[PDB]
Amino acid sequence: MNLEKPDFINVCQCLIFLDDPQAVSDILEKLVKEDNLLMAYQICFDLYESASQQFLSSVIQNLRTDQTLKMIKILSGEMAIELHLQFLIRNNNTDLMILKNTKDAVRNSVCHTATVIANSFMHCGTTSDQFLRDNLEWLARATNWAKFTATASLGVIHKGHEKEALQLMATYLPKDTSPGSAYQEGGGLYALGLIHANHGGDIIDYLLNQLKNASNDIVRHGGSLGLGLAAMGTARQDVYDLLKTNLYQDDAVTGEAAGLALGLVMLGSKNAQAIEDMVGYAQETQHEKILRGLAVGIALVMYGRMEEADALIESLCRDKDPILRRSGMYTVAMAYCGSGNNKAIRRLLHVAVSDVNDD
């Protein structure tokens, strides 16, 4: 850091090893003031690339309060996402023959859903729905089960394009179009979340507002999933309270999405309150959907801890419930990922090999 020439790599990287968001904000401010375009701009993108949540946000907060506006925009990353979108549009590659042989492999089983998802994976970020629209029209005979996966496909093709994809998905208003096929609305909310992935703030706000003002039947699944996707790691009070209300109301049908959204909003926070709430609700309730969503939540509640996760998972993955075992090991695995943590690998392989419990 103290080398006379402010070379990009060392000062971008050592500061995040030492966890100095204030120091990197200060150096970014000095670069902005001196208006060294290359140094400031490249160091800001390198901070964005190498840093993570709770770090980039802290640095941008301390930077906001000559190129300050540019640094704020590029740390927000909307320009980087736009570059990724335009590259996907340009160098996007599609296979019509594969679309057709997947349509041939379409059968009465879940395989037709598989074909739609594969075609949309190939057509991710195309901003053009003719082949996929025709495929969905051809497969628009088995609904009330495949709407969720079809709207997932529509979300992945039009992800991060709220300028027009928002309207393209809002063209599917559920109430008038199909009251009987109740997954219409859930798929609408789910595609809204998937499309507005990597988008927060106002996205989080209008997701949570329509989730407050709506039914609790099917919309809540996709709504909570999209809300967590938009507020990943944020753990802001309003979405946290909505998710806690949904969880503790015992609405089991949506408790899965509620737990998934809890995990997303407490992504990496290592919130002891959150983990204790999740565990207690686990013993309180006995629904499989609740257990799986809560398993997701406990899975991504924390990562990179190496100080509390070991004891926490020794307590939780040992617990009575196989879902608790699976979620606790999820937590320890993604919390000791990045290094060969001997104790974490020890607990992981031991629970792999000793107990006969299939989960």
Binding site: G340, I345, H350, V353
Partner: peptide, 25 residues
């Protein structure tokens, strides 16, 4: 370089030897 490379490789291999041995019982 190779010093800590071999240190970590030995740590992981000695761990996995014991862990996989734990299944003999």
């Amino acid at each position: 370089k190779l010093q800590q490379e071999l240190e970590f490789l030995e740590v992981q291999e000695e761990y996995i030897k014991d862990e996989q041995k734990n299944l003999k019982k």
